[PDB]
Scaffold this active site. Structure first.
Site, PDB file in Angstrom:
ATOM      1  N   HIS A 233       7.150 -25.932  20.344  1.00 27.22           N
ATOM      2  CA  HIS A 233       6.076 -25.577  20.961  1.00 27.22           C
ATOM      3  C   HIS A 233       4.979 -24.947  20.061  1.00 27.22           C
ATOM      4  O   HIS A 233       4.794 -23.743  20.516  1.00 27.22           O
ATOM      5  CB  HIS A 233       6.328 -24.842  22.278  1.00 27.22           C
ATOM      6  CG  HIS A 233       6.800 -25.688  23.142  1.00 27.22           C
ATOM      7  ND1 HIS A 233       8.134 -25.746  23.699  1.00 27.22           N
ATOM      8  CD2 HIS A 233       6.253 -26.761  24.036  1.00 27.22           C
ATOM      9  CE1 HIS A 233       8.397 -26.816  24.681  1.00 27.22           C
ATOM     10  NE2 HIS A 233       7.192 -27.316  24.839  1.00 27.22           N
TER      11      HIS A 233
ATOM     12  N   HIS B  16       2.748 -29.306  17.634  1.00 28.21           N
ATOM     13  CA  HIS B  16       2.668 -30.117  18.770  1.00 28.21           C
ATOM     14  C   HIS B  16       1.249 -29.918  19.600  1.00 28.21           C
ATOM     15  O   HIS B  16       1.002 -31.234  19.904  1.00 28.21           O
ATOM     16  CB  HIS B  16       3.841 -28.996  19.757  1.00 28.21           C
ATOM     17  CG  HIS B  16       3.673 -29.627  21.159  1.00 28.21           C
ATOM     18  ND1 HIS B  16       4.103 -30.965  21.525  1.00 28.21           N
ATOM     19  CD2 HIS B  16       3.050 -29.052  22.382  1.00 28.21           C
ATOM     20  CE1 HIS B  16       3.812 -30.788  23.084  1.00 28.21           C
ATOM     21  NE2 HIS B  16       3.445 -29.842  23.410  1.00 28.21           N
TER      22      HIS B  16
ATOM     23  N   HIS C 273      -3.100 -26.336  25.044  1.00 31.51           N
ATOM     24  CA  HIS C 273      -2.142 -26.588  26.509  1.00 31.51           C
ATOM     25  C   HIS C 273      -1.088 -25.665  26.308  1.00 31.51           C
ATOM     26  O   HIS C 273      -0.253 -25.504  27.358  1.00 31.51           O
ATOM     27  CB  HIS C 273      -1.828 -27.973  26.682  1.00 31.51           C
ATOM     28  CG  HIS C 273      -0.656 -28.459  25.984  1.00 31.51           C
ATOM     29  ND1 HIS C 273      -0.732 -28.971  24.621  1.00 31.51           N
ATOM     30  CD2 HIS C 273       0.355 -28.808  26.327  1.00 31.51           C
ATOM     31  CE1 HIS C 273       0.449 -29.141  24.299  1.00 31.51           C
ATOM     32  NE2 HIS C 273       1.081 -29.247  25.262  1.00 31.51           N
ATOM     33  N   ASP C 274      -0.493 -25.294  25.146  1.00 28.46           N
ATOM     34  CA  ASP C 274       0.728 -24.313  25.117  1.00 28.46           C
ATOM     35  C   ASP C 274       0.416 -23.234  24.321  1.00 28.46           C
ATOM     36  O   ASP C 274       1.323 -22.574  23.535  1.00 28.46           O
ATOM     37  CB  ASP C 274       2.190 -25.312  24.352  1.00 28.46           C
ATOM     38  CG  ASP C 274       2.549 -26.264  25.425  1.00 28.46           C
ATOM     39  OD1 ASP C 274       2.834 -25.913  26.304  1.00 28.46           O
ATOM     40  OD2 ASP C 274       3.044 -27.254  24.785  1.00 28.46           O
TER      41      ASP C 274
ATOM     42  N   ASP D  44       1.556 -35.197  26.423  1.00 25.91           N
ATOM     43  CA  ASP D  44       2.593 -33.976  26.169  1.00 25.91           C
ATOM     44  C   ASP D  44       3.882 -34.740  25.853  1.00 25.91           C
ATOM     45  O   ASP D  44       4.716 -33.857  24.920  1.00 25.91           O
ATOM     46  CB  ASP D  44       2.640 -33.291  27.504  1.00 25.91           C
ATOM     47  CG  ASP D  44       3.174 -31.759  27.301  1.00 25.91           C
ATOM     48  OD1 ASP D  44       3.174 -31.477  25.889  1.00 25.91           O
ATOM     49  OD2 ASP D  44       3.479 -31.228  28.208  1.00 25.91           O
TER      50      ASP D  44
ATOM     51  N   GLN E 187      19.295 -38.585  27.024  1.00 27.92           N
ATOM     52  CA  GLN E 187      18.007 -39.174  26.361  1.00 27.92           C
ATOM     53  C   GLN E 187      17.734 -40.581  27.385  1.00 27.92           C
ATOM     54  O   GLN E 187      16.636 -40.572  27.997  1.00 27.92           O
ATOM     55  CB  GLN E 187      17.987 -39.549  25.047  1.00 27.92           C
ATOM     56  CG  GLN E 187      17.911 -38.251  24.381  1.00 27.92           C
ATOM     57  CD  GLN E 187      16.531 -37.514  24.322  1.00 27.92           C
ATOM     58  OE1 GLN E 187      15.397 -38.070  24.230  1.00 27.92           O
ATOM     59  NE2 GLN E 187      16.587 -36.356  24.721  1.00 27.92           N
TER      60      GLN E 187
END
Ligand SMILES: Cc1cccc(Sc2nc(N3CCN(c4ccccn4)CC3)nc3[nH]cnc23)c1
Ligand SMILES: [Mg+2]
Ligand SMILES: [Zn+2]
Length: 314
Positions: free
Chosen positions: A69, A73, A107-108, A218, A270
């Site tokens: 993050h 990113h 956004h982060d 995202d 996953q």
């Protein structure tokens, strides 16, 4: 400005248009990639170059040196949005095109490499300030802080009206990045699409569609070429396992996804993620925005690579 078009080397000029573009390991080129994307997505006129660079460089400063993050990113998530916006030219407003690349880059902001759940279990001050979507309300707060620094108001030329609208697009866009909120958003979008009630003139409908774009951008590591997908997973897990360690220190058995002792369960986990989150996200997005289809195709290719990992074919 204003005859000062940013340009990228040939291979980047071409591949930056594709959904699967990886922005590469040269950190110093990422600001110019972003400005390139804003100029092509929005116009050379939407922002004052000087203000925009100062904004980008303060946003970069407020991302931390965590495994996943981080600043890369941010810029990766903005690139996926650029690809969607550029493949859906005529579907979005002037205010949306502006709002959404900025929302993605922000956004982060100031992420600490920890989940909303960890903050709540730790009893972090942010969990008292924002009882739900904790980190996401923080990220929006940091975005407004940076916008209010001297010479950082990239929205200075908008009216009072347009400014409130753009900050409201950005707010809803950043809140939508709380995955806990994606499941309900997508279920509503799928029902609307199928009963034929989806209406892009309904603001409430537009909000939901933008929410799904945000999730799609995202999660976009799952839409990259397999070696990017696989090497990005390592970064994502390096954060999660560190969180698991911190959970063990508070006296709490973490979920297996965050337990480095349960590495062996990664491939099967996953498959669940692809089936429960990623494939449905890009399927509903493709239904609403057919030109986003290459994201769904890439994701299905990466599910098939994880199937092979489990079969020991790699
Ligand atoms: C691309 C990627 C890679 C790593 C993490 C994420 S986010 C994520 N992943 C999952 N999955 C995948 C991880 N999975 C496990 C299980 C046991 C061991 C290892 N992994 C558990 C379900 N479930 C979730 N619910 C909410 N967010 C997630 C995405
Ligand atoms: Mg986030
Ligand atoms: Zn993110």
């Amino acid at each position: 400005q204003g005859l000062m078009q940013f340009t990228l080397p040939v291979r980047l000029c071409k591949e930056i248009e594709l959904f699967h573009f990886d922005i590469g390991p040269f950190e110093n080129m990422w600001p110019g990639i972003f400005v390139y994307m804003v100029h092509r997505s929005c116009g050379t006129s939407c922002f004052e170059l000087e203000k925009l660079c100062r904004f980008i460089m303060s946003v970069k400063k407020n991302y931390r040196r965590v495994p996943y993050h981080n600043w890369k990113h941010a810029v990766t998530v903005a690139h996926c949005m650029y690809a969607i916006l550029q493949n859906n030219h005529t579907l979005f407003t002037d205010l949306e095109r502006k709002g959404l690349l900025i929302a993605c880059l922000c956004h982060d902001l100031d992420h600490r490499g920890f989940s909303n759940s960890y903050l709540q279990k730790f009893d972090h001050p942010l969990a008292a300030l924002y009882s739900t979507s904790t980190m996401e309300q923080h990220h929006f707060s940091q975005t407004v802080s940076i916008l209010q620094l001297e010479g950082h108001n990239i929205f200075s030329t908008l009216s009072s009206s347009e400014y409130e609208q753009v900050l409201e697009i950005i707010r809803k866009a950043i809140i939508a990045t709380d995955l806990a909120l994606y499941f309900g958003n997508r279920k509503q979008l799928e029902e609307m699409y199928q009963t034929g009630s989806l209406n892009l003139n309904n603001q409430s409908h537009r909000d939901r569609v933008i929410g799904l774009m945000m999730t799609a951008c995202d999660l976009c590591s799952v839409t990259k070429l397999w070696p990017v997908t696989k090497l990005t997973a390592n970064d994502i897990y390096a954060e999660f396992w560190a969180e698991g360690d911190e959970m063990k220190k508070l006296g709490i058995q973490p979920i297996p996804m965050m337990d480095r002792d349960k590495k062996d369960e990664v491939p099967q986990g996953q498959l669940g993620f692809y089936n429960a989150v990623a494939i449905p996200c890009y399927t509903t997005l493709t239904q609403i925005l057919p030109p986003t289809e290459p994201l769904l195709k890439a994701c299905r290719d990466n599910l098939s690579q994880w199937e092979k990992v489990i079969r020991g074919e790699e």
